[PDB]
Chain length 237, copies 6
């Protein structure tokens, strides 16, 4: 349990990213620990609500950078795409608490949560166009931001403030940094009073509407677009 | 015609919920009168625009749960498919513009009355909620939530049962305009009057352009999918207690 | 190139609507030239980003109708399907970032010029509308309204024909940024210049990611569906008066 | 009961088209009686299965064109949207199994009667066609063609106006079974009888499983889209001749 | 590892997964399904495997879910367990990024379809009989609604409404079965086909499979499967409201 | 013109693939000429129906085989995907007459036609899996053949007879080789009697149903999957296949 802390109390499972020395950059080991924590929470009948949070100044700087396309495709399809979709589908409510920087692969950790609470000084970005890739592997951008904002931030690599993403509906609530854990836990507690099958089916109502709208199919389509970026990058260098 | 009043003047059909003594709680009889009113307005060539409004402090407290031998899910499923789902979809598709005027509380089944309207004008005091998760059900029968609020707000308000102010739902696009409560009726009628000057077939097809876009996006199919999700909640409640809600 | 000016420098193709004396009303000749300019930009290896802008006070007043012995719906359908629908979709899909700079009035057909652009920057003074219901038609030929405004706002502005301010459309996400009118061109070019530092294939695939998400959501199919709904408007106007619109 | 006969026995509602003097061509009166018969069967708890059949040599020769000072597309659109599109979708969605027994010719509008049924049994002699391109229209109002035939056969039969045999439409899956003409009623009745033994809620939800799969695939949205395409045909015919069909 | 119900062999780049509960006509209890899921995972993760073959010992491919296999039984409980071992398992097998082939002999009833439909290709013995008679038990078809996609809607409704069986030749006509072969050659024909496919480059196979499966998901496959799962569960909900047990 | 012949008579535009010495293998010049021919037919108000046919033994052996992924992507998106979709959408009926072998890229020529008439001898295949690619650029396979048959023929590279593809609905009619041109022209002639706007909208009714079902979006999705095959082939060897 190096990289990920796990606590259960009052029917809330709190999963903490604990690699602040690297701004919670994600290596394969961290991702495997994180996927195990989600599974543990999903399987525990004493857990009603999942809280995903991070220690330190920044939620996550993204994937830790430190050969065939088939190899990249296979690895990214598991740890990036399959993991994030599995988290998305866990049949209990989940809430991310985001402070400071949430960059590129960071979005693959919070987007799968049902609700997001952000500190006022949180900054969200996906500057991977600079590295020759058309946005990260799990394309929540268009769904979360709308297409024009998604294009703007992909084309420029600029950051968005917490208030800006709250306006698009990607962030549910913006609170001062000193209230982020308070607000997240209070909301988790309110939700934890509710019947678990009703929570499950409320979640399913919304997620199935998104899937009818094309969410699953679109996420799969964009994964292949992303991979053409890797294929081009390899062909150049 | 106890529960629903109906007026036609100046090419506007005004349908009024008139059960203020129960905060416009909806029993089968009210819903049948309401559907007949919508049909009357739809079929009247002297009506260009439909206004739906409510008497009293509150638009609607929702379904009236005080309105057989061995109760089965088949029975609940059949009845709710007719008076909740089919009725609300039928209103949604009436080929003339419709405007809901919403004051005070609009709770759970109240949403099945205003969401089918094309436009919603809300009083500053309006409070929208769907707290049915408390009763073991994953939101009301007609799932406009994700479409009207976006998925994250939809989940938030279903998971918590909290209310949203008129200003909050205006931000999502669910409400077109927010006005002081003393101006709700006048602003709604003024807007209806502006729209009533337009060519009826253009109004019909403008409405169709937007609604068919939504159907291509998956609206019809999603509404049908979530109805079955809703009904699994009744099924579970019955398996726990013998009753369709906890 | 009578009505459209084309300039390339700094990795930017600037395409300018140059009919200010008619408030950039669009006749078929202007549209043919505009389509040629988009195609030229798409093929130009000196070009990373496209900027669409307009001379004068107004971005575009819409389609020029001042602009066949037995007139038929078949004829209207065929021409509108090419210069309105096919052109706008082709611009939409050009595999390079595009930015519309919109000042003053952008009415009805005007929207067919800016909606296909990836990003829209509007002057504080910009006013967007689609009042064609007055002419017996259910919104313009390319139905961006629902996608850009949300369904309730789309219905409201079609049913009433009212205008929306730059601020109003920025709240729906249809406009990316609102800036003072005297900064519109500078701000647009600065943003284009930022984007033009990026690798072209990454820009193309970022654009694709978003536009393909939209097509999976139903964008292409919905645009085609609404085109026919629009054409039933022309069909009705013709059945009433023998003319494509109510006059 | 001028045009439509109706019988309920062994939990089967049999709806019979009874206008052989016009080869079961459909005037508004016949369609109104037919819709009433479907509603009656839908609402009757003693009915588990619906059978639609026809008297005489032909299932239906289609819409009766022999059954307003300034005729407008608005008027045509409004009427066709009700008795053609809305009626057929309503029958499609009745929450009980339905079976069409089709003999002889089923032409154009005839398809609006059998396609909404869940299952089709055809006589060996049956001929299916939609030659409405001759009248300047892109196929009938309710576009099952692509769904039932596949897109290439749909285009071929629309573009040529040719008829398809029972065998040919059985190969596409549009017809479930082909039997000799003198066995059509007996085979249909036996099939209905087999289905009528099953629990009604399971029948309802098996039907929903398939029909909701179709709506997620785009059926409802596609049907609505093609109705507008159809109407552009009327709009063009009126622009050429002042009449809805060439 | 403990092996109980599933035989597993890897040779010549083919993983052959065998249902080995012929004493129960390969009726599927939760343990069998867990073991079968593990076998699919083993094959998926083995770089020496290019193709997966699913087959069954004895006369019958699978009689379906084992009926004889909590103080207060609730729909939540049934929903949770079926969502895992029926729906999630079958979707996971569907998505394994290597070609898979089912060899189907004799009866393949109801839950049996959840084992073969996830395979890419189906080879059936001339004697194979496919059915889903669960309407008799008050349920609108099994949990993973392949029926409409595999059979077309009219055939799907016919066989659900009647509970009748379809011959191998009948399902081959809809495209659900790729090839019908004599019973005594089913294993040889299947392995020969697996061998031919196992000569191809693995990434090209993966992306050919993806091309088709992603086309199906754009068409609505994932969303429709999820939708019908809830329809199926309303059947259980109703059966419990009538009798207290999840099937009539 | 070098590779494509074009004739208009009796309201039929006949477009002929005329590179028989190469079994109508498709180089970029041939494809540009083909696209020009489709455009000419589409724009000619005296043409009601388009017939696409081929000289020699074979309809088309596919793309003529005789560097970055960006370059391959750009070129294939134009001449293969954009061209084929443009042809698919021409607002007039079109009919392909397919004799002999139609392999891989050959499918990009006939699938965009509304109707396909095949000689009894015709053989259809897509063996590109052998070259490390997940089927050709325009993924009609699932739509035309169904998913199981599409997977089988992609995974094996086997050919399908005219009778087999007729059973799936991909071929409208199968006729003897010596009657292919006559049967196609007679069918075109029947269709050319019909009102052009009704033909247009009949075509639209079916094609829009397909696009509501997901056809446009799916074709775009699979194009990217195809390009990951080129991406991988280049990462192994340096060439696209
Ligand atoms: Zn990556
Ligand atoms: Zn309910
Ligand atoms: Zn127009
Ligand atoms: Zn008609
Ligand atoms: Zn079950
Ligand atoms: Zn290629």
């Amino acid at each position: 349990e190096m990289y990920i802390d796990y606590d259960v109390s009052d029917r809330i499972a709190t999963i903490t990213l604990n690699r602040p020395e690297a701004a919670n950059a994600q290596n394969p080991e961290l991702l495997d620990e994180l996927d195990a924590a989600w599974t543990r929470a999903a399987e525990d009948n004493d857990v009603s609500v999942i809280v995903l949070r991070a220690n330190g100044k920044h939620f996550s700087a993204g994937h830790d950078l430190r050969l065939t396309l088939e190899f990249i495709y296979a690895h990214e399809s598991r740890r990036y795409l399959e993991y994030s979709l599995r988290w998305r589908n866990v049949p209990k409510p989940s809430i991310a608490a985001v402070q400071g920087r949430c960059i590129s692969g960071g979005l693959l950790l919070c987007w799968p949560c049902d609700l997001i609470i952000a500190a006022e000084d949180a900054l969200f970005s996906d500057p991977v166009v600079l590295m020759d890739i058309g946005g990260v592997e799990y394309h929540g951008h268009t769904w979360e931001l709308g297409p024009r904002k998604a294009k703007e931030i992909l084309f420029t690599g600029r950051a968005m403030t917490a208030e800006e993403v709250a306006q698009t509906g990607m962030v549910n609530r913006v609170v001062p940094r000193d209230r982020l854990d308070a607000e997240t836990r209070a909301l988790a507690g309110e939700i934890a009073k509710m019947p678990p099958f009703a929570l499950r089916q409320a979640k399913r109502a919304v997620n199935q509407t998104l899937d009818v709208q094309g969410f699953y199919a679109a996420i799969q389509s964009v994964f292949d677009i992303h991979q053409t970026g890797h294929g081009n990058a390899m062909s150049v260098s």
